[PDB]
Amino acid sequence: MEEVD
């Protein structure tokens, strides 16, 4: 689960 690079 990813959020902002």
Place this chain on the structure above:
Amino acid sequence: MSQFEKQKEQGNSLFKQGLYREAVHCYDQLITAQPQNPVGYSNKAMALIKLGEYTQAIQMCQQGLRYTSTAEHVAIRSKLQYRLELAQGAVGSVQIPVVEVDELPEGYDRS
């Protein structure tokens, strides 16, 4: 609720220009509307690695893994464990493989 997904992308983009206090204002909006949600702390841990304070981010990811005990927060459990790996990622990477020609920094072994 898609506005809160494009406002965090504005935050990352502002750290990409040097508007760090307006970029902090974007994480501060998330904790202003959601004071006790680990989402806001995940976006503060993002802001810390985007302001070069990775030594805070490795602690703040442990602090956010304490917000994971239920089936409402299994995404948060992944989210702070990849944030911890990518804080160590952003500080510990140098991009030189010291072998072959697959990526490299500019020049090095192809001039």
